[PDB]
Amino acid sequence: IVGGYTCGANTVPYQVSLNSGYHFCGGSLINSQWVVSAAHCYKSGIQVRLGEDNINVVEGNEQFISASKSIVHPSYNSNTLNNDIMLIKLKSAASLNSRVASISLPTSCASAGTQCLISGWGNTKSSGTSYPDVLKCLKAPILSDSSCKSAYPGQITSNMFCAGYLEGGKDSCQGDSGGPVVCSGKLQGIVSWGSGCAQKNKPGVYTKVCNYVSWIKQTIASN
Ligand SMILES: NC1CCCCCC1
Numbered sequence: 001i002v003g004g005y006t007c008g009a010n011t012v013p014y015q016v017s018l019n020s021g022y023h024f025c026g027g028s029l030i031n032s033q034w035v036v037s038a039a040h041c042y043k044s045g046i047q048v049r050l051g052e053d054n055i056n057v058v059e060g061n062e063q064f065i066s067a068s069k070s071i072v073h074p075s076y077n078s079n080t081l082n083n084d085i086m087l088i089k090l091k092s093a094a095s096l097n098s099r100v101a102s103i104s105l106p107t108s109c110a111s112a113g114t115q116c117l118i119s120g121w122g123n124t125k126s127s128g129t130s131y132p133d134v135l136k137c138l139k140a141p142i143l144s145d146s147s148c149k150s151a152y153p154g155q156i157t158s159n160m161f162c163a164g165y166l167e168g169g170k171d172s173c174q175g176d177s178g179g180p181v182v183c184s185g186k187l188q189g190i191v192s193w194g195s196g197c198a199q200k201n202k203p204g205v206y207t208k209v210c211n212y213v214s215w216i217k218q219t220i221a222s223n
Protein backbone atom coordinates (compact mmCIF):
# COMPACT_ATOMS: atom_id res chain seq x y z
CA ILE A 1 0.00 0.00 0.00
CA VAL A 2 1.46 3.36 -1.11
CA GLY A 3 0.36 6.56 0.65
CA GLY A 4 -1.69 4.71 3.26
CA TYR A 5 -1.56 4.34 7.02
CA THR A 6 -0.96 1.67 9.65
CA CYS A 7 -4.32 -0.07 10.15
CA GLY A 8 -3.69 -1.18 13.71
CA ALA A 9 -3.23 -4.77 14.87
CA ASN A 10 -6.22 -7.00 14.03
CA THR A 11 -8.48 -4.10 13.04
CA VAL A 12 -9.10 -5.73 9.64
CA PRO A 13 -10.08 -9.22 10.87
CA TYR A 14 -10.97 -10.64 7.43
CA GLN A 15 -7.51 -9.84 6.00
CA VAL A 16 -5.40 -12.96 5.42
CA SER A 17 -1.80 -13.47 4.33
CA LEU A 18 -1.12 -16.27 1.84
CA ASN A 19 2.21 -17.88 2.69
CA SER A 20 4.36 -20.35 0.72
CA GLY A 21 7.47 -19.92 2.89
CA TYR A 22 6.97 -16.15 2.65
CA HIS A 23 4.03 -13.75 2.26
CA PHE A 24 3.12 -13.52 -1.44
CA CYS A 25 -0.51 -12.33 -1.59
CA GLY A 26 -3.46 -11.09 0.41
CA GLY A 27 -6.88 -12.68 0.66
CA SER A 28 -10.26 -12.24 2.37
CA LEU A 29 -11.90 -14.70 4.78
CA ILE A 30 -15.54 -15.12 3.67
CA ASN A 31 -16.52 -17.97 5.99
CA SER A 32 -14.81 -20.22 8.55
CA GLN A 33 -13.33 -22.43 5.83
CA TRP A 34 -12.95 -20.34 2.65
CA VAL A 35 -10.81 -17.44 1.43
CA VAL A 36 -11.27 -15.28 -1.68
CA SER A 37 -8.13 -14.05 -3.47
CA ALA A 38 -6.90 -13.17 -6.98
CA ALA A 39 -6.42 -15.87 -9.63
CA HIS A 40 -3.01 -14.36 -10.42
CA CYS A 41 -2.06 -15.35 -6.84
CA TYR A 42 -2.52 -19.04 -7.68
CA LYS A 43 0.33 -21.34 -6.66
CA SER A 44 0.78 -24.67 -4.88
CA GLY A 45 1.76 -25.14 -1.23
CA ILE A 46 -0.39 -22.34 0.24
CA GLN A 47 -0.74 -21.82 3.98
CA VAL A 48 -3.41 -19.32 5.00
CA ARG A 49 -2.37 -17.02 7.85
CA LEU A 50 -5.20 -15.37 9.75
CA GLY A 51 -5.08 -12.93 12.66
CA GLU A 52 -1.82 -11.40 11.40
CA ASP A 53 -0.48 -7.93 11.97
CA ASN A 54 3.32 -8.16 11.82
CA ILE A 55 3.85 -11.05 9.38
CA ASN A 56 7.43 -11.61 10.63
CA VAL A 57 6.53 -11.94 14.33
CA VAL A 58 4.23 -14.34 16.17
CA GLU A 59 2.18 -11.91 18.28
CA GLY A 60 -0.49 -14.27 19.69
CA ASN A 61 -3.67 -13.97 17.60
CA GLU A 62 -2.55 -15.95 14.54
CA GLN A 63 -4.11 -19.06 13.10
CA PHE A 64 -2.00 -20.87 10.49
CA ILE A 65 -4.06 -23.30 8.38
CA SER A 66 -2.90 -25.10 5.22
CA ALA A 67 -5.06 -24.89 2.09
CA SER A 68 -6.76 -28.16 1.08
CA LYS A 69 -7.76 -26.88 -2.34
CA SER A 70 -7.57 -23.92 -4.66
CA ILE A 71 -10.17 -23.15 -7.33
CA VAL A 72 -9.27 -20.54 -9.94
CA HIS A 73 -12.24 -19.02 -11.74
CA PRO A 74 -13.15 -21.17 -14.78
CA SER A 75 -12.79 -18.18 -17.15
CA TYR A 76 -9.65 -16.59 -15.68
CA ASN A 77 -7.47 -15.26 -18.51
CA SER A 78 -3.88 -14.64 -17.35
CA ASN A 79 -3.15 -12.38 -20.34
CA THR A 80 -6.09 -9.95 -20.06
CA LEU A 81 -6.54 -10.58 -16.31
CA ASN A 82 -10.29 -10.93 -16.86
CA ASN A 83 -12.02 -12.92 -14.08
CA ASP A 84 -9.12 -12.46 -11.64
CA ILE A 85 -10.61 -14.38 -8.75
CA MET A 86 -9.87 -17.61 -6.95
CA LEU A 87 -11.26 -19.52 -3.96
CA ILE A 88 -9.09 -21.27 -1.37
CA LYS A 89 -10.49 -23.85 1.06
CA LEU A 90 -8.81 -24.37 4.44
CA LYS A 91 -7.93 -27.88 5.66
CA SER A 92 -9.76 -27.03 8.89
CA ALA A 93 -12.25 -24.32 9.88
CA ALA A 94 -10.76 -21.19 11.44
CA SER A 95 -11.89 -20.32 14.96
CA LEU A 96 -13.85 -17.11 14.42
CA ASN A 97 -13.55 -14.31 16.98
CA SER A 98 -13.26 -10.49 17.09
CA ARG A 99 -9.80 -10.58 15.46
CA VAL A 100 -10.41 -13.36 12.90
CA ALA A 101 -13.74 -12.76 11.19
CA SER A 102 -15.40 -13.26 7.82
CA ILE A 103 -16.39 -10.38 5.53
CA SER A 104 -19.83 -10.33 3.89
CA LEU A 105 -20.25 -10.80 0.15
CA PRO A 106 -22.11 -8.02 -1.67
CA THR A 107 -25.83 -8.36 -2.38
CA SER A 108 -25.47 -5.50 -4.87
CA CYS A 109 -22.61 -3.85 -6.76
CA ALA A 110 -21.01 -0.65 -5.43
CA SER A 111 -21.21 2.66 -7.30
CA ALA A 112 -18.53 5.15 -8.34
CA GLY A 113 -17.89 7.55 -5.44
CA THR A 114 -18.33 4.90 -2.75
CA GLN A 115 -15.50 5.00 -0.22
CA CYS A 116 -13.70 1.69 0.39
CA LEU A 117 -10.94 0.31 2.61
CA ILE A 118 -8.04 -1.36 0.80
CA SER A 119 -5.45 -3.23 2.86
CA GLY A 120 -2.28 -5.32 2.62
CA TRP A 121 1.39 -5.98 3.33
CA GLY A 122 2.64 -4.83 -0.07
CA ASN A 123 5.29 -2.35 -1.18
CA THR A 124 4.88 1.15 0.29
CA LYS A 125 7.03 2.89 -2.37
CA SER A 126 5.84 4.07 -5.81
CA SER A 127 9.40 4.03 -7.23
CA GLY A 128 11.62 2.09 -4.83
CA THR A 129 10.90 -1.01 -2.76
CA SER A 130 10.06 -1.19 0.93
CA TYR A 131 7.83 -3.80 2.60
CA PRO A 132 6.24 -2.76 5.95
CA ASP A 133 5.60 -6.06 7.83
CA VAL A 134 2.55 -4.63 9.68
CA LEU A 135 -0.77 -4.29 7.84
CA LYS A 136 -1.30 -1.05 5.90
CA CYS A 137 -4.64 0.54 5.03
CA LEU A 138 -5.90 2.98 2.41
CA LYS A 139 -9.26 4.67 2.06
CA ALA A 140 -10.11 5.23 -1.60
CA PRO A 141 -13.18 5.96 -3.73
CA ILE A 142 -14.44 3.77 -6.55
CA LEU A 143 -13.93 5.64 -9.84
CA SER A 144 -16.44 5.92 -12.68
CA ASP A 145 -16.33 3.25 -15.40
CA SER A 146 -15.64 5.99 -17.99
CA SER A 147 -12.61 7.40 -16.12
CA CYS A 148 -11.36 3.86 -15.49
CA LYS A 149 -11.63 3.01 -19.21
CA SER A 150 -10.00 6.35 -20.14
CA ALA A 151 -7.10 5.59 -17.76
CA TYR A 152 -6.53 2.16 -19.34
CA PRO A 153 -7.78 2.21 -22.96
CA GLY A 154 -8.89 -1.20 -24.26
CA GLN A 155 -8.20 -3.03 -20.99
CA ILE A 156 -11.13 -2.58 -18.58
CA THR A 157 -13.73 -5.35 -18.76
CA SER A 158 -17.14 -5.56 -17.06
CA ASN A 159 -15.45 -7.58 -14.28
CA MET A 160 -13.05 -4.77 -13.28
CA PHE A 161 -13.28 -1.41 -11.56
CA CYS A 162 -10.82 1.35 -10.71
CA ALA A 163 -10.39 2.79 -7.23
CA GLY A 164 -8.03 5.44 -5.92
CA TYR A 165 -6.89 8.84 -7.17
CA LEU A 166 -6.13 10.05 -10.71
CA GLU A 167 -3.61 12.51 -9.21
CA GLY A 168 -1.50 9.56 -7.97
CA GLY A 169 0.26 9.08 -4.62
CA LYS A 170 -2.18 6.57 -3.09
CA ASP A 171 -2.62 3.00 -4.36
CA SER A 172 -2.26 -0.73 -3.78
CA CYS A 173 1.08 -2.18 -4.91
CA GLN A 174 3.18 -5.37 -5.26
CA GLY A 175 2.32 -7.86 -2.49
CA ASP A 176 -1.16 -6.39 -1.95
CA SER A 177 -2.38 -8.68 -4.76
CA GLY A 178 -5.47 -10.71 -3.89
CA GLY A 179 -6.35 -8.55 -0.88
CA PRO A 180 -9.67 -6.90 0.05
CA VAL A 181 -11.49 -3.81 -1.13
CA VAL A 182 -14.27 -3.41 1.44
CA CYS A 183 -17.02 -0.81 1.07
CA SER A 184 -19.81 -0.39 3.64
CA GLY A 185 -19.01 -3.77 5.22
CA LYS A 186 -19.07 -5.74 1.95
CA LEU A 187 -16.21 -7.25 -0.06
CA GLN A 188 -16.61 -5.38 -3.36
CA GLY A 189 -13.12 -5.80 -4.82
CA ILE A 190 -9.96 -7.88 -4.98
CA VAL A 191 -6.54 -6.25 -5.57
CA SER A 192 -5.86 -7.22 -9.20
CA TRP A 193 -3.60 -5.02 -11.36
CA GLY A 194 -2.33 -1.63 -12.45
CA SER A 195 0.49 0.09 -14.33
CA GLY A 196 3.04 0.58 -11.56
CA CYS A 197 1.73 1.93 -8.25
CA ALA A 198 0.35 5.35 -7.32
CA GLN A 199 1.23 6.82 -10.71
CA LYS A 200 -0.66 9.79 -12.14
CA ASN A 201 -3.71 8.72 -14.20
CA LYS A 202 -3.06 5.04 -13.39
CA PRO A 203 -5.33 4.08 -10.51
CA GLY A 204 -5.46 0.54 -9.16
CA VAL A 205 -7.73 -1.94 -10.93
CA TYR A 206 -9.82 -4.38 -8.89
CA THR A 207 -11.84 -7.53 -9.56
CA LYS A 208 -15.56 -6.71 -9.39
CA VAL A 209 -16.65 -9.22 -6.72
CA CYS A 210 -20.42 -8.61 -7.05
CA ASN A 211 -20.28 -10.32 -10.48
CA TYR A 212 -19.01 -13.54 -8.84
CA VAL A 213 -21.31 -14.01 -5.83
CA SER A 214 -23.35 -16.74 -7.54
CA TRP A 215 -20.20 -18.62 -8.57
CA ILE A 216 -18.69 -18.25 -5.08
CA LYS A 217 -21.78 -19.62 -3.36
CA GLN A 218 -22.38 -22.53 -5.74
CA THR A 219 -18.68 -23.47 -5.59
CA ILE A 220 -18.62 -23.40 -1.78
CA ALA A 221 -21.89 -25.38 -1.66
CA SER A 222 -20.33 -28.30 -3.61
CA ASN A 223 -16.73 -28.30 -2.34
N1 LIG B 1 -2.42 -1.62 -8.01
C1 LIG B 1 -1.71 -2.83 -8.43
C2 LIG B 1 -1.63 -3.82 -7.26
C3 LIG B 1 -1.55 -5.26 -7.74
C4 LIG B 1 -0.13 -5.66 -8.12
C5 LIG B 1 0.36 -4.84 -9.30
C6 LIG B 1 0.78 -3.45 -8.87
C7 LIG B 1 -0.34 -2.41 -8.98
Ligand SMILES: [Ca+2]
Pocket residue numbers: 052053054055056057058059062
Ligand atom coordinates in the same frame (compact mmCIF):
# COMPACT_ATOMS: atom_id res chain seq x y z
CA1 LIG C 1 2.38 -12.33 13.13
